[PDB]
């Protein structure tokens, strides 16, 4: 069925050190079964300088807090409260991201 043939990418661990405005990305999703996806990387911000996160990554967890079925507000709160050194588990899911961004 739909999604069964998506290419699975291995989840990755990305450690981000918070900067003056945050972690340097934005998120969409957290509603209607859509997970939390990175939609924006701020130029020069922590996520950018790390070089690892990208648009279309789903954030699976933040500091071990599961965000697979979290609301958008829950995800934003988790990111706000994650401290100075933030451990993100992300999985690049371009097929899904594309289906949800249409």
CA atoms within 13 A on the CB side of 84: 0
Helix/strand/coil (H/E/C) assignment for every residue in 17-78:
ECCCCCCCEEEEEEECCEEEEEEEECCCCHHHHHCCCCCCEEEEEECCEECCCCCHHHHHHH
How many angstroms separate the CA atoms of 67 and 79, rounded?
A: 10
How many angstroms separate the CA atoms of 82 and 67, rounded?
A: 13
Contact 76, 40 (CB under 8 A): no
Question: What's the resolution in A?
Answer: 1.2
Burial of residue 7 (CB within 10 Å: 0-12, 13-18, 19+) is exposed
- Domain range holding 34? 1-102
- In the chain, how many domains are there? 1
Quick count: other Cβ atoms within 10 Å of Cβ 33?
Answer: 8
């Amino acid at each position: 069925g739909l999604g069964e043939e998506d290419i699975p990418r291995e989840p990755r661990r990305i450690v981000i050190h918070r900067g003056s405005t945050g972690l340097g990305f934005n998120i969409v999703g957290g509603e209607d079964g859509e997970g939390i996806f990175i939609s924006f990387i701020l130029a020069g911000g922590p996520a950018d300088l790390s070089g690892e996160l990208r648009k279309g990554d789903q954030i699976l967890s933040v500091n071990g807090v599961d965000l697979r079925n979290a609301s958008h507000e829950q995800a934003a709160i988790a990111l706000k409260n994650a401290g100075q050194t933030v451990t993100i588990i992300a999985q690049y899911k371009p097929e899904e991201y594309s289906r949800f961004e249409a």
